[PDB]
Design a protein around this nucleic acid. Structure first.
Ligand SMILES: Nc1ncnc2c1ncn2[C@@H]1O[C@H](COP(=O)(O)OP(=O)(O)O)[C@@H](O)[C@H]1O
Ligand SMILES: [Mg+2]
Ligand SMILES: [Zn+2]
Ligand SMILES: [Zn+2]
Lengths: 623, 565
DNA sequence: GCATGCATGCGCATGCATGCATAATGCATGCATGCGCATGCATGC
């Protein structure tokens, strides 16, 4: 037929168009930054098919904007009627693959998966005109249910003469034969489920992160259905991009009747997943794969690491719009790198906290809140809590029951979603003792234990904490000591790796510089790649020199902190020193920790608490 | 009773007739232009005024008022019949639904001979091919009614109501006509829907399936179906119309395609609607017979200078309030007896988006948000997004509320993590607070105004004279313009030049030096400089100047000095 | 002001009175007409 009913799509024309485009397309703007591992002077998609033949992956990913660049009619027809277009694309690709690479072994033929449809619109702006069309989503996963088996081909057996048949599902309904095929008995055919064929299904709930937000809009929850290999490709807390079709389903009046409601439900059928983002750091998914084809970038970063000032440069490049507080930014960078994740299960000690927890104590008239906001917006898997707004049960996990299905026994809280991430706590003073009780175990054991009615479980909460606090009077009164000003139990304070006592010196140079900077307010990719490479390619280790330096630092710290009025020292500070030294070793791209790293860690530890200016026998900071 | 054909012809001639009104000062064929736009997809809904019809025939208007639904259907059919006449060209660009409509009309022309007999079931449903909606505007002579007094006498009539919005439903598609395809034929079956629930069909009524007696079975399709935009609204009475000792009553409204996304929770709205019942089947009741539930179907929803001239004095505070309204957090502490609450009330009334809280009555769930049968509904802080919020008796609030308010002021977002709720809410609102006689207010807020009642004889006598004048003549001694002026002002965004920085820098340094000289001073920090810059930008916006000037900086400095003193 | 007690409050299970859904077959009676009988009328011789 020339056209399909209700559409303008021609099958043969689109097939030829796609086959030609798979050989013709070339784009000059896509440099080696994203045309990764491919000869740019050659056609791109044919090279992709060749790489598929090399590896044997039965799936190919296609960017929509490339097709739109080639022509607009194909783009519009793919967006409008995906059902009439994608199956043509599958066979168009398969014919080319089998012609160019005959007798290549595959378990099943090639399926094409579009991605990156340009839509920057709020989901509430969707209209019935867009039903059954291809859309994109950027969000975070919060709930994933168990797999559901759904039938595709039924198996029937004759109860009288053991004759067996198979019936393929058509239009979503199975028609079982009412008469046998060898004894002609009526209604002798019985259905056997285990002999049939099934497919996987999963339901996902996602939280929207729209670019455009109207006035007074509450957050949104989106229901997604994932099938086959797309199952288990995302985990709660992950920030992903999704490409899929927009659907509508009627709802029954009640489960025992077949009547349906007039007002329809809605959901989105996922077709494609993406993890890359141009604003936030790389996730752990891509780090666990050998995708560093950019040997140019590898060489550039390895040459940069040998330069002496790169450390400071990183502290300069972490935040352009933030002030002269270089020590804070260095501490945040060392937090980003993190310590080595050693394995101590054979020892029986348990898990050892390899991450960095930092505290910033100061007056409200400072920039600690902006630092927390920047760290939240910069790192993936980030969470932000503020004061009494959260409860003890709000963190960890809580008991629930599904509003759509019968039960969902447990649902994760803020801390678990932050697993392998960063949690920023603000107004730490106002938090009650009930939540601090949870924090006590979270901050050290990296695990949570929950024991309630019919629910006994242990969860992983491997997070890193950035806490902000205020003086009790909202002023740093110099007559009172540091401990009296902070007013926190020593058990909670001891677990913080670094404590930054923000103080106002009222220096004229500071005033001039800050005023000039603030009034004047009227490579990120290189940093991202370097951080990912260092975080995923090197395991720090230390020699005896670092060991003895650490021991000397520990005894010196114990001598200094013995005097009352100042924050006393504990054995956990030794482990904090070890973690900071390992992070500094990671910064230099060194597998060996040198005495320079230990000395730098000691310097940061001394400077953060301002113990040099502080009077050792009165506990009062001086200038 | 009158025949519908005559009135349909009258409707057609009324649509074809009027030439009168034009905005640019001429005589323009308005309904002809509307119909021409309706011919293609350049307009997808049409609103008809019942004041314009009143010129030639009032009995039509009365019959429309008492029997609104039938007349709506008649108007729709008349306009659909008129559409082919005014059509002049084919669609330049069309979407999926138009593709179905064109294809169906083309094959109808292909197959159906003019002489063959066609069964009444063989025709297309009227609303399936139609793609335009008709709505009515309430008569100006008709007086808006009260929610309490609409009763069984008003079922089926056309009414106009005014109320306050409290609940809004998210947009979801609603079925209009369902499309079925047979298992063994190329025919298409259409099922209209006029019930809250319906039962999908099974067998095919197509002629070929009947002749062959094949027993083909129908399947639903979503592409061929027609869907409309549907919303549900909850309204309440104004506090003015409630009788003595009673409680405001509520009503439910349903909203259609283009009227969707007009109203937001907390808004005051005027609704032109039809009052219709719903037949209820469910739990058994005491009294036999046919009972029903009432609901309203909407067709149209409609939503320096002197600040509080009644209050004497506080001129500088009024200037600061003006700047806060215009924009780039203000706290007032005062002795009892000085009208601080009335200023907050005036601010709430003046602002387009505003909320006013009195204390523990709105504490807790009244702020932040909560989950209700599931949908998340916000509190006062959420409603006042991109507006101005007003809080009275700030010191008496619970600590949790104060922490939430501090978070809103500094971070501008709320975070909730409790059993069942895990969200971040956007609150881009500026806060005005009132209190009675702390470092938290000085450190967090931008401007503090301390109102001390010094018993000066002249000031007290003038205040007494002003109050006597107000109480006697009911007017101060000798808002729409103010709202329009603020709206025009906020459109622009001035910028800070490079040179003035030095001057500003110098001032800041000197100010801090003075603050360091006066050991009794309490707070100076970069936040004060930011507040000064924001005030200067607001003043420059008031002058509509592209570049910040010196007078704005001087006035901001003077205002901060006056507040601190 | 911080630590503790606690009257209020909410969601899903079972128990129990009312209420709802289902659903052809066999036997009897009056109208039409055959078959045997006796009376009676009409027609021959
Ligand atoms: N400057 C003023 N001009 C006119 N009326 C005033 C003035 N100050 C106070 N009042 C009157 O005094 C009353 C003050 O009460 P209120 O504003 O409720 O006090 P507060 O807000 O401190 O609780 C108001 O009713 C107001 O009419
Ligand atoms: Mg008051
Ligand atoms: Zn058989
Ligand atoms: Zn059919």
């Amino acid at each position: 037929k020339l056209v399909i009913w209700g559409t303008d799509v021609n099958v043969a024309a689109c097939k030829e168009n796609f086959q030609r485009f798979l050989q013709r397309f070339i784009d000059p703007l896509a440099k080696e930054e994203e045309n990764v591992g491919i000869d740019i002077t050659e056609p791109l998609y044919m090279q992709r098919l060749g790489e598929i033949n090399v590896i044997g992956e039965p799936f190919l990913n296609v960017n929509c904007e490339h097709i739109k660049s080639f022509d607009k009619n194909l783009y519009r027809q793919l967006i409008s009627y995906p059902q009439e277009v994608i199956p043509t694309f599958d066979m168009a690709v398969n014919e080319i693959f089998f012609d160019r690479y005959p007798d290549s072994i595959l378990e099943h033929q090639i399926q094409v998966r579009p991605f990156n449809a340009l839509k920057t619109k709020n989901m509430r702006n969707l209209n019935p005109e867009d039903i059954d069309q291809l859309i994109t989503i950027s969000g975070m996963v919060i709930r994933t249910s168990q797999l559901i088996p759904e039938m595709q081909e039924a198996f029937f057996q004759c109860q009288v003469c053991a004759h067996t048949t198979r019936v393929e599902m058509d239009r979503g309904r199975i028609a079982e034969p009412s008469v046998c095929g060898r004894c002609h008995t009526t209604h002798s055919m019985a259905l056997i489920h285990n002999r049939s064929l099934f497919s996987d299904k999963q339901m996902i709930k996602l939280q929207e992160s729209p670019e455009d937000m109207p006035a007074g809009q509450t957050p949104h929850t989106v229901i997604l259905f994932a099938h086959n290999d797309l199952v288990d490709k995302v985990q709660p807390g992950d920030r992903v991009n999704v490409t899929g079709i927009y659907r509508a389903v009627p709802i029954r009046v009640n489960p025992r009747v077949s009547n349906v409601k007039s007002v329809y439900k809605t959901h989105i059928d996922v077709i494609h997943y993406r993890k890359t983002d141009a604003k936030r750091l790389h996730g752990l998914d891509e780090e666990a794969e050998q995708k560093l084809f950019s040997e140019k970038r590898v060489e550039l970063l390895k040459e940069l690491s040998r330069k002496p000032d790169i450390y400071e440069r990183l502290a300069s490049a972490l935040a352009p719009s933030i002030y002269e507080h270089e020590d804070i930014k260095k501490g945040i960078l060392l937090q980003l790198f993190g310590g080595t994740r050693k394995d101590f299960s054979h020892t029986g000690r348990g898990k050892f906290r390899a991450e960095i927890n930092i505290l910033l104590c100061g007056d409200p008239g400072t920039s600690k809140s902006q630092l927390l906001q920047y760290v939240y917006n910069l790192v993936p898997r980030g969470q932000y809590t503020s004061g009494k707004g959260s409860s003890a049960v709000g963190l960890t996990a809580y008991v629930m029951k599904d509003p759509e299905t019968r039960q969902l026994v447990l649902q994760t809280g803020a801390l678990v979603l932050s697993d392998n991430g960063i949690c920023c706590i603000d107004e730490f003073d106002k938090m009650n003792e009930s939540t601090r009780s949870v924090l006590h175990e979270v901050m050290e054991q990296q695990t949570l234990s929950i024991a309630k009615a019919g629910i006994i479980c242990q969860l992983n909460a491997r997070t890193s904490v950035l806490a902000a606090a205020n003086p009790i009077e909202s002023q740093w009164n110099p007559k009172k000591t540091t401990i009296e000003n902070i007013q926190l139990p020593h058990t909670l304070l001891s677990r913080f790796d670094l404590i930054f006592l923000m103080l106002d010196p009222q220096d004229e140079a500071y005033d001039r510089r800050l005023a000039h900077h603030l009034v004047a307010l009227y490579d990120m990719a290189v940093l991202k790649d370097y951080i990912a490479y260092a975080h995923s390619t090197i395991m720090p280790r230390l020699s005896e020199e670092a060991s003895q330096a650490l021991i000397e630092a520990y005894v010196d710290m114990r001598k200094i902190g013995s005097s009352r009025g100042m924050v006393s020292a504990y054995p956990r500070q030794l482990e904090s020193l070890i973690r900071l030294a390992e992070a500094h070793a990671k910064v230099r791209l060194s597998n060996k920790v040198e005495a320079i790293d230990v000395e730098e860690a000691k310097r940061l530890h001394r400077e953060a608490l301002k113990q040099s200016a502080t009077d050792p026998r009165t506990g009062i900071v001086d200038i | 009773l009158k025949d519908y054909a005559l009135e349909k012809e009258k409707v057609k001639k009324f649509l074809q007739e009027f030439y009168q009104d034009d905005e640019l000062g001429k005589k323009q064929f308005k309904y002809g232009n509307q119909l021409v736009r309706l011919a293609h997809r350049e307009q997808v809904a049409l609103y008809v005024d019942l004041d314009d019809v009143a010129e030639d025939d009032p009995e039509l208007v009365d019959s429309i008022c008492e029997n609104a639904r039938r007349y709506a259907k008649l108007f729709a059919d008349a306009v659909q019949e008129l559409l082919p006449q005014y059509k002049e060209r084919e669609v330049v660009n069309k979407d999926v639904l138009d593709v179905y409509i064109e294809h169906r009309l083309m094959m109808e022309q292909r197959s159906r001979d003019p002489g063959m007999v066609r069964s009444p079931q063989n025709q297309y449903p009227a609303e399936l091919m139609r793609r335009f909606e008709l709505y009515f505007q309430g008569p100006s002579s008709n007086k808006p009614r009260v929610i309490r007094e609409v009763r069984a006498d008003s079922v089926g009539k056309l009414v106009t109501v005014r109320g306050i919005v409290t609940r809004v439903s998210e947009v979801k598609p609603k079925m209009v006509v369902a499309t079925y395809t047979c298992d063994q034929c190329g025919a298409e079956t259409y099922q209209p829907i006029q019930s809250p629930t319906f039962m999908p069909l099974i067998m095919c009524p197509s002629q070929e399936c009947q002749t062959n007696r094949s027993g083909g079975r129908l399947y639903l399709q979503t592409r061929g179906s027609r869907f409309i935009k549907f919303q549900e609204m909850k309204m309440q009475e104004h506090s003015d119309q409630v009788p003595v000792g009673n409680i405001p009553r509520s009503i439910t409204v349903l909203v259609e395609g283009e009227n969707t996304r007009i109203a937001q929770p907390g808004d005051h709205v005027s609704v032109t609607g039809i009052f219709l019942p719903i037949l209820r089947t469910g739990f058994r009741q005491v009294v036999q017979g046919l009972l029903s539930e009432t609901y309203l179907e909407a067709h149209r929803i409609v939503k320096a200078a002197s600040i509080a001239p009644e209050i004497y004095g506080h001129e500088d505070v009024k200037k600061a309030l003006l700047l806060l309204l215009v924009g780039g957090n203000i706290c007032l502490m005062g002795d009892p007896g000085v009208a601080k609450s009335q200023l907050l009330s005036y601010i709430d009334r003046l602002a387009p988006r505003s909320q006013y809280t009195t204390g523990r009555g709105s504490s807790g769930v009244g702020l932040t948000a909560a989950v209700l049968r599931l949908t998340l509904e916000g509190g006062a802080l959420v409603l006042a997004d991109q507006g101005v919020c007003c809080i009275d008796e700030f010191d008496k609030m619970a600590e949790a509320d104060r922490t939430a308010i501090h978070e809103v002021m500094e971070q501008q977002t709320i975070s909730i993590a409790k059993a069942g709720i895990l969200t971040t809410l956007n609150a881009r609102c500026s806060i005005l607070a009132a209190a009675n006689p702390p470092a938290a207010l000085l450190s967090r807020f931008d401007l503090l105004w301390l109102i001390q009642d010094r018993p000066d004889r002249d000031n007290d006598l003038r205040l007494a004279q002003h109050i006597t004048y107000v109480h006697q003549h009911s007017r101060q001694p000798p808002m729409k313009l103010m709202r329009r002026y603020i709206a025009m002002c906020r459109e622009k965004q001035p910028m800070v030049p490079e040179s003035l920085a030095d001057y500003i820098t110098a001032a800041y340094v000197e100010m801090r030096r003075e603050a360091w000289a006066s050991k009794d001073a309490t707070y100076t920090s970069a936040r004060t400089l930011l507040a000064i810059l924001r005030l200067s930008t607001a003043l420059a916006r008031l002058r509509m100047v592209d570049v910040v000037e010196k007078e704005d900086v001087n006035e901001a400095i003077r205002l901060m000095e006056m507040s601190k003193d």
